[PDB]
């Protein structure tokens, strides 16, 4: 996250990380046993970590839970990133407390201008490599679809939107994919891609969770 801040305590209890011997993506706890992330985060083995803030120094409330089932969206497109969404079934159920809890799915598609909180342990530098210990947070509003599609001509499908600032300087970055875009208590977006990070006229593009609400419950139900 570029241009963000240290998340206050227990400010994002739904945040999780996906791990393959290093921290490589974020995700969101949406059910006692399920995390949602991006399709490009797929790996054949994944360990989920919940309740972190400092990713290098244990604070004591961390839970380490390997993925039992890992389900990339069946129409995931590696070349265009359309349907860049993924479900993960935890092999045991998370213990719910003040630092680990679920977040609701959205009851309506993103609304232009709503303020959202985006979070993750991705890059904090727009040039180079500066990856933080402390979990990062960014308030940034949803941008209009006029603005979004002008920013990425021909490449924004109906399963995508833009969050941030056209003037640049504040964005999600590498290592943040899969992480949450939460607006008024609903998971509206998943960190997916962009042209670099925090550049002029290149805001982050995020998967619109509302379009998969039905698939998520159905796919979860079949594997419960």
């Amino acid at each position: 996250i570029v241009g963000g801040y240290n998340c206050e305590e227990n400010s994002v209890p739904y945040q999780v990380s996906l791990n393959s011997g290093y921290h490589f993506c974020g995700g969101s706890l949406i059910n006692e046993q399920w995390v949602v992330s991006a399709g490009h985060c797929y790996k054949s083995r994944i360990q989920v970590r919940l309740g972190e803030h400092n990713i290098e120094v244990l604070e004591g409330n961390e839970q380490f839970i390997n993925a039992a089932k890992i389900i990339r969206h069946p129409q995931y497109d590696r070349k265009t990133l359309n349907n860049d969404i993924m479900l993960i079934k935890l092999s045991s159920r998370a213990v719910i407390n003040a630092r680990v809890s679920t977040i609701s799915l959205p009851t309506a598609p993103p609304a232009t201008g709503t303020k959202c909180l985006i979070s993750g342990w991705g890059n904090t530098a727009s040039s180079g490599a500066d990856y933080p210990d402390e979990l990062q947070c960014l308030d940034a509003p949803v941008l209009s679809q006029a603005k979004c599609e002008a920013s990425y001509p021909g490449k924004i499908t109906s399963n995508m939107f833009c969050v941030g600032f056209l003037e640049g300087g504040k964005d999600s970055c590498q290592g943040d994919a899969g992480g949450p875009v939460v607006c008024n208590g609903q998971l509206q977006g998943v960190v997916s891609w962009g042209d670099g990070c925090a550049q002029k006229n290149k805001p982050g593009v995020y998967t619109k969770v509302y379009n998969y609400v039905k698939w998520i419950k159905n796919t979860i139900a079949a594997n419960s």
Binding site: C25, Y152, A177, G194, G196, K202
Partner: protein
């Protein structure tokens, strides 16, 4: 010899996935994923190769 693989891109678009899946350049620099590396080779007109997967 013992050379490096040319980096390549799949995203026929204007941007890159935001995974962290670093790769080690022949310049000694770790790039967070292969896509970001091909963009730098386009942008700065360079030709860094992939020495090996993972960080440098």
């Amino acid at each position: 010899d013992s050379l490096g693989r040319e980096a390549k891109c799949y995203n026929e678009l204007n941007g890159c996935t935001k995974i962290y899946d670093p790769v080690c350049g022949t310049d000694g620099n770790t790039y967070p994923n292969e896509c970001v590396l091909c963009f730098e080779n386009r942008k700065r007109q360079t030709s860094i190769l992939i020495q090996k997967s993972g960080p440098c």
